[PDB]
Structure formats: structure tokens, C-alpha cells
Design a protein around this nucleic acid. Structure first.
Ligand SMILES: [Mg+2]
Ligand SMILES: [Mg+2]
Lengths: 50, 202, 175, 191, 151
RNA sequence: GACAGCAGGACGGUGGCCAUGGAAGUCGGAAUCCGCUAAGGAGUGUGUAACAACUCACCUGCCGAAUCAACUAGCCCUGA
């Protein structure tokens, strides 16, 4: 199942911060939404894990 | 805080310098808290180990007090996690050679040095199942009478190899001793003498 | 105020009327920055009516004089204290200006407050003006103008808006 | 706050040579040559040293965003120097699902052809950049090596590969499949 | 050697620890019966039990733990039959029994020779912590004994 | 010799105490101390049903001199 390759794919697809307002995949250590559709808000949440 | 605490640390270091004129320089870059407590509680009846940050560069100020001989030779020697060991007893050259005790060596990701780890054909002796780590790595195992044995003789970790999480957990469950390391003496300083321990002391 | 053009510094002394209840008024003294002496006298009445029990009818102004600069040929550093009234609520402020004279520095203070903070001459109340020396300036702009042997060129210096003919074969270069 | 000059310092080794006819930087070394244009930025690029090769990136008054911009020139000059001395090598392991991915090259390493693609029958073709070559690694399962000189070209080719391998119309937390960038490094190692 | 820190009643309600044990299959009821025999009268609360297994049976050693014997130095017994009056009565003096207790505490504390162990076991409680007429803030400051007589 | 970065440590009493389906710092209520100290908060989070691993408060190894936090109001943006 290659857990190291699963960790790499989760690094490139899963561990992100999703904003509650602009709905943008940004960065794991993000602060604000880089998109100007919301106003660079800090209302973030980690992407949901199982 | 961090002002009265630093002044109290200054009082402790001037008390240890005025009490114990004999010292040993050690390095403990790869050490654990339980290991340090074992070393302290095995050496309660003798020398006392002290560590710290750039406040340990204090013999310069102790010489700026102008109450010393030329003892500042150890000022370019405190580089790369250098700690003092203050003493009064020895006068005895068997310290740390009869006291370099074997310590766990618990399996943790990060250690590469110095040797290899080999697992011969030996039963595990563990409960059900303890086979998932062997399935994640790949080891020819056969289930005998209840303790599951290993058919082949494989090498897990070579020299300079990074330790993985599943490898560390299976080594912790098999209790085969991983890489061990204790505090290493680096420079001997006894009453203003410049020792060159490559190889002169002991 | 209007703060039209450059400003001027006026020393204005003023006292109460000599009354039989209390003769010899204390004859107070202020340092008013104003475009001319009439605005200086009126702003003096404004500040002294803020401070003490004084008004234009029951008092008088003894003297109102121009205050010339003690050293106009010296590039000096002035700290200005501000009591400006913003849109929500009023605020105190400390600003620094490197300029020749005090009236010019307070002029730049009015122009800069009107530029950045949209403050009119109605809202700005100059609390105090004090020359400060080097190694006391809180501001990084004046701190980086504090350079001996200072060097900078003038990149992209375009000028002469239609002083040249409007229709030429030239293609003007900069620097 | 109209800050007076900001200058960035670049040391240039003796293996390579730099030449500027303006804001155009031309760096020629052992592994080919590489030239770029800094026309839209207007920051002075001076050099000094008789066979000492000290570059300076100097900007006068400017603004805060332009003082942010003046370090970007120094960093791209460092990237060009590393690309002309050592080169760039991106190693991409094919993290594959139940269906494996068959990656071949067609036009001498400039056309990556992708097959079997999570069971999708559509054979995928990705044309790379002029100046980057592709290879399938040896002594390692499904590793894809991209070698080149310019970091922007090599990483844009790797971005085209990792975006051409993309799970669509699904929960992409599940089906962790695609050619992702595993290792970033140089061609000539130990330097 | 198996270690376990549990105790209410004895149990035997089709639920037990053994997990390492059934590799050799030595405890199924005899180990529980001898554990009952070693838990007769000591006590009615959580104890620490370690069994040494050498090829025929289990040797049941009870190493006493500090907070467990502090709870055992309460007023006995409180097991069932109108409990909860209320939770934290604990009106004792313990001026010598905790002293004998940490005299028995050897090689498991990483301690100074009775230096501040009085402070340790006087402030490591949540029910008693002192004789009823003084304060543990006075225990922290006003102990000047034991450090000569104990070593 | 700070903020950042990279690396290591992050214990003993104690599987503390009220809780039994479980808490053995991580659902939960009340608390709150000592030793080693280079430092450990009866513990900031992830995770286990719990036992385990990871990380943080704090400390130390290299680098090297400025850095961080909370408010406030002018332009501009989202709200539109
Ligand atoms: Mg669907
Ligand atoms: Mg608008």
C-alpha cells in the first residue's frame, strides 16, 4: 500500500488549511485567504481527516 | 522572571568555581532525560555536571574580575554543546572508564551511527498477532509452536541509515538493542593545566 | 485656521482686565503658529479660553510679535506634538520633521497631516514644538536621513512639461 | 517610507562568467549558458572585481514592494548560477493506486506519454520545454527524472506532469494517485 | 513478570488481564485464586500486583505505591453499603507512617536522602495533606527534621 | 547573543486524585507541589475505545542583530 508514498500524496493533497469564507485550498501553515473574493480573512480550518 | 534567575545562576557558577577548581569537559548532544537522571543518581557521591547556554561563557567575566591566573584558555574550547563537570575528589584516573555504563538505547527515528542491526533466526515470544510490522517490512516468518519464528536472517538498519517509525516500533517490541550513546569527555582541565587527551590521560 | 501658504510663529502675551477684585493679571504667554497675526490673536483667544477663565471681552492682548528663526541656515530636527480630532475620536500624536525653520516644520506638519490623516486646520491643535538633536529621533525616515557622506542619484528625472515645443522630433531621455 | 539604497551581494565562482548589456543577465559556464531579462523591474545591476566576480543588485528610493522586489533578483541570479554550475534534477515517484501508471518518453525525452491512468483508457501526452530532458530512473520503481538548466522550465514541466495526472470528479482524499514531485536537487551532487 | 495496577473487588466475571500470559497458558483460574489469596485483607482499593512466572505458577509480589497507600492510610473500610459521605474526608496526622513509607520507598523516586520528600508526599495529596490544625503552606516552609535521622 | 530557520531533550513521584465503557498528561468536575535541573507546564494540540507513537509550553547545539504582540485611523479591497 506504500505508506511512505501515501504520506507523500497526503502531503501534496490533504494537509491544507481551507478557509471558511472563500473556500480555497491554500497551505498547511496559512494565515489568510490569498484570493480577493473574500477580503483576505483569517477564518481558516484544517482540511478534514478520517 | 529571567533576571533574578540569571543572577542566581551567576551565584551558582561563582560558587562552583570558588569551591571546585578541578573540572572535566563533556558533550551530551544525544542524551535522554532518564539517561541523565541515571547518570546523576549513579554519580551522586562524586562530581556534579552543569550545562547551559552562553551564560556558561562566564570565565571571561571571572577573569575580568582580575582574581585569577591565565585560566581563560578554555574560552575557545566551549563550542558545540560543551558542559562542565566540577569535582574535588580525583586525584584518581579511573573516572568514566569504569563508569561508562551501558544505557538504553530505545528505538527512535533519527539515529544513523555507527553500526548495523542484524536479527537472527529467533522466536518473537509476543502475543497475537505481532505480524503486521513484519508484513509492512517483509520478513520470511513461520508460525511454529506459539512463538512465531523467523526463517531467514535479514538486516534491518545498515550504517548511516535513517530509522523509520514501523522499524522503531518493531525494534521496541522485539527488545533488540538499538543505537546507544552516552556523554563523551572531550577536554581535561585540572588546576590550570592544558591536557591533550589524544592520548595522554588515563 | 486656513494655514494658507507657509506658516509664521508669533509670541502672543495676554492678560485679563485690571479689576478692583483682583489687580495685576498674570500676563500669560503662548507661541502660536498662524499665517498672520490676526489669526494668531484669534487662535490665542481660543487656546486661552480652553485653558483658563478668559475671553476676548474681559481680557486683552498685550503684545503679538513675529518670532524669527534663531538659525535659518541650519538643517534641524523638530518634534511636533499633535492633538488632532479624527472622524471617530481625537488622538495625540508625536511626529518628527527635518527642516530648516520652526515655522516651515510646522507648515510641513499641517500639510502632512492633511495629506495622510485627512485632518483639516479645524482639528489640528499643536501641543508643543521642540528641537531635538541626533540619536533621539524615534522615526526611521529621519534616522536614515541621519547619514554623513550621504549619496543618492536622481533616477528617472523627467521635467519640462511643454516648455519644449509640443511637436518635435526628439524622444527625451532621463538622467 | 522611501528608503535609501538597498544592495544585494552575489559572489560568482571562477567556473562561470557573467555578462550584462543592461538589465539582461547572461551567465555562461560548464553546463551550457543561460540568459534572462530583467527589463520590467528597473533595478541597477553592477559588477566588480578583476577575476573576483562580485555582483551587486542596487535599488534606490523605491517603495516597500520594490524593496521586496530587489531580493528576488538576487535569488534568481543564485538560481541561474546553481543551474549553470550543477543543473536541476527533479525526481518524481509515481504514487500509484490499484491501477499502475505506464510512463514512457517518445521524442528523445521531450514528450512524456502516460498510460493506464487510474483505469482511464485515454492515453495522455505532455510536451515538455525546450531545455529540459526526461528519463525513467534505474534501480528504483517508477521514478521519473527531469534534468535541465532553468529552474522555471524544469519546475513548470513537473507542474504540467503533476497537473496532467489529476483525479477529477472524485473525492481526491481517496484515490491518492498521480505523479508527484518527490525530490528536488542538482545533477552534479556533493557540491 | 507481569505488572498490573488495578483493584476493586477480585472479579472473575469473565474478564481479566492475561494477554501476555496465554502464550504459555498458565493463568486461567489458579492465578486469579492466588491473586485473591494475596488480596485477602490487603485491601479494598487499587493495589499494584506483579507476578513472576517460572514454568509452573505465579509469585505475587505487591509493591506498595505512594498515593495508593496514602489512600490506604484513611479511615477503613469504605467498599460499599452506603458510600459517598462525601468524597474527601481524610482526617489523619500521618506524622510517622508516611515517614516509614518513604523509608520503604527505595530506588523508585530518584530522590535526595530524605531532603524534600516530606514536601513531596505532603503536597502530593488531594484529600488530607496535613494534620487538621495547620496548613500545607506551613508544611512547605516549616519542616526542619528527618534529613539527619533518616540517612 | 532575541525573533525566524535546521537538530536534539521534553522525565521521576504518578497508570495522581471524583469517575469502572474507558483517561495511563489528551470525554469529563475540583485542583497545583517537590527532585533532576539544560527542562518538563499533574500538561497546547493530533491520534488510540483505552494502552502506545508525533508535536507544543520550556531548554540547549549552529547562524547572527534587531524583533514581536494588541489596539487606533487615512486610501484601497471584500461585504455589494
Ligand atoms: Mg461522488
Ligand atoms: Mg467599494
Amino acid at each position: 500500500i506504500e505508506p511512505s508514498l501515501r504520506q507523500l500524496a497526503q502531503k501534496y493533497n490533504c494537509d491544507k488549511m481551507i478557509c471558511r469564507k472563500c473556500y480555497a485550498r491554500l497551505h498547511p501553515r496559512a494565515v489568510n485567504c490569498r484570493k480577493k473574493k473574500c477580503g483576505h480573512t483569517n477564518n481558516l480550518r484544517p482540511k478534514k481527516k478520517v | 522572571d529571567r533576571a533574578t534567575w540569571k543572577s542566581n545562576y551567576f551565584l551558582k557558577i561563582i560558587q562552583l568555581l570558588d569551591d571546585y577548581p578541578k573540572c572535566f569537559i563533556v558533550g551530551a548532544d544525544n542524551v535522554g532525560s532518564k539517561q541523565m537522571q541515571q547518570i546523576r543518581m549513579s554519580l551522586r557521591g562524586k562530581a556534579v555536571v552543569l550545562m547551559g547556554k552562553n551564560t556558561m561563557m562566564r570565565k571571561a567575566i571571572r577573569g575580568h574580575l582580575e582574581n585569577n591566573p591565565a585560566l581563560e584558555k578554555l574560552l575557545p574550547h566551549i563550542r558545540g554543546n560543551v558542559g562542565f563537570v566540577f569535582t574535588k575528589e580525583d586525584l584518581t584516573e579511573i573516572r568514566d572508564m569504569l563508569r561508562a555504563n551501558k544505557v538504553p538505547a530505545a528505538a527512535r527515528a533519527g539515529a544513523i551511527a555507527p553500526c548495523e542491526v542484524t536479527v537472527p533466526a529467533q522466536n518473537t515470544g509476543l502475543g497475537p498477532e505481532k505480524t503486521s510490522f513484519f508484513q509492512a517490512l517483509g520478513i520470511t516468518t513461520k508460525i511454529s509452536r506459539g512463538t512465531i519464528e523467523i526463517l531467514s536472517d535479514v538486516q534491518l538498519i545498515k550504517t548511516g541509515d535513517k530509522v523509520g517509525a514501523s522499524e522503531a516500533t518493531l525494534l521496541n517490541m522485539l527488545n533488540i538493542s538499538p543505537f546507544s550513546f552516552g556523554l563523551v569527555i572531550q577536554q581535561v582541565f585540572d588546576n590550570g593545566s592544558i591536557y591533550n587527551p589524544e592520548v595522554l590521560d588515563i | 485656521m486656513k494655514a494658507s501658504g507657509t506658516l509664521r510663529e508669533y509670541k502672543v502675551v495676554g492678560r485679563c482686565l485690571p479689576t478692583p477684585k483682583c489687580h495685576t493679571p498674570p500676563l500669560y504667554r503662548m507661541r502660536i503658529f498662524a499665517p498672520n497675526h490676526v489669526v494668531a490673536k484669534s487662535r490665542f483667544w481660543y487656546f486661552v479660553s480652553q485653558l483658563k477663565k478668559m475671553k476676548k471681552s474681559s481680557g486683552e492682548i498685550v503684545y503679538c510679535g513675529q518670532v524669527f528663526e534663531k538659525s535659518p541656515l541650519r538643517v534641524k530636527n523638530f518634534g511636533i506634538w499633535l492633538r488632532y480630532d479624527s472622524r471617530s475620536g481625537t488622538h495625540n500624536m508625536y511626529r518628527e520633521y527635518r527642516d530648516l525653520t520652526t515655522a516651515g516644520a510646522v507648515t510641513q506638519c499641517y500639510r502632512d497631516m492633511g495629506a495622510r490623516h485627512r485632518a483639516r486646520a479645524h482639528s489640528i491643535q499643536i501641543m508643543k514644538v521642540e528641537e531635538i538633536a541626533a540619536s533621539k529621533c524615534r522615526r526611521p525616515a529621519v534616522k536614515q536621513f541621519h547619514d554623513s557622506k550621504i549619496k543618492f542619484p536622481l533616477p528617472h528625472r523627467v521635467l519640462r512639461r511643454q516648455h519644449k515645443p509640443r511637436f518635435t522630433t526628439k524622444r527625451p531621455n532621463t538622467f | 517610507m522611501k528608503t535609501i539604497l538597498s544592495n544585494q551581494t552575489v559572489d560568482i565562482p571562477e567556473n562561470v562568467d557573467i555578462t550584462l548589456k543592461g538589465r539582461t543577465v547572461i551567465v555562461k559556464g560548464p553546463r551550457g549558458t543561460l540568459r534572462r531579462d530583467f527589463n520590467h523591474i528597473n533595478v541597477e545591476l553592477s559588477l566588480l572585481g578583476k577575476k573576483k566576480k562580485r555582483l551587486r543588485v542596487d535599488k534606490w528610493w523605491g517603495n516597500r514592494k520594490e524593496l521586496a522586489t530587489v531580493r528576488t533578483i538576487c535569488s534568481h541570479v543564485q538560481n541561474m548560477i546553481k543551474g549553470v554550475t550543477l543543473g536541476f534534477r527533479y525526481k518524481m515517484r509515481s504514487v500509484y493506486a490499484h491501477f499502475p501508471i505506464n510512463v514512457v518518453i517518445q521524442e528523445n525525452g521531450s514528450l512524456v506519454e502516460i498510460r493506464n491512468f487510474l483505469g482511464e483508457k485515454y492515453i495522455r501526452r505532455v510536451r515538455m520545454r525546450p531545455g529540459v530532458a526526461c528519463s525513467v530512473s534505474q534501480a528504483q520503481k517508477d521514478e521519473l527524472i527531469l534534468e535541465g538548466n532553468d529552474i522555471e522550465l524544469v519546475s513548470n514541466s513537473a507542474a504540467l506532469i503533476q497537473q496532467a495526472t489529476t483525479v477529477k470528479n472524485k473525492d481526491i482524499r481517496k484515490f491518492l494517485d498521480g505523479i508527484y514531485v518527490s525530490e528536488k536537487g542538482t545533477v552534479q551532487q556533493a557540491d | 513478570v507481569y505488572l498490573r495496577c488495578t483493584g476493586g473487588e477480585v472479579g472473575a466475571t469473565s474478564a481479566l488481564a492475561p494477554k501476555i500470559g496465554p502464550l504459555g497458558l498458565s493463568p486461567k483460574k489458579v492465578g486469579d485464586d492466588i491473586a485473591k489469596a494475596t488480596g485477602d485483607w490487603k485491601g479494598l482499593r487499587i493495589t499494584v500486583k506483579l507476578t513472576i512466572q517460572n514454568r509452573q505458577a505465579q509469585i505475587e509480589v505487591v509493591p506498595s505505591a505512594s498515593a495508593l497507600i496514602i489512600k490506604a492510610l484513611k479511615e477503613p473500610p469504605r467498599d460499599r453499603k452506603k458510600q459517598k459521605n462525601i468524597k474527601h474526608s481524610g482526617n489523619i496526622t500521618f506524622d510517622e507512617i508516611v515517614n516509614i513509607a518513604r523509608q520503604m520507598r527505595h530506588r523508585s523516586l530518584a530522590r535526595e536522602l530524605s531532603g524534600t520528600i516530606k514536601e513531596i508526599l505532603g503536597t502530593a495529596q488531594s484529600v488530607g495533606c496535613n494534620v487538621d490544625g495547620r496548613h500545607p503552606h506551613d508544611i512547605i516552609d516549616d519542616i526542619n527534621s528527618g534529613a539527619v535521622e533518616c540517612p
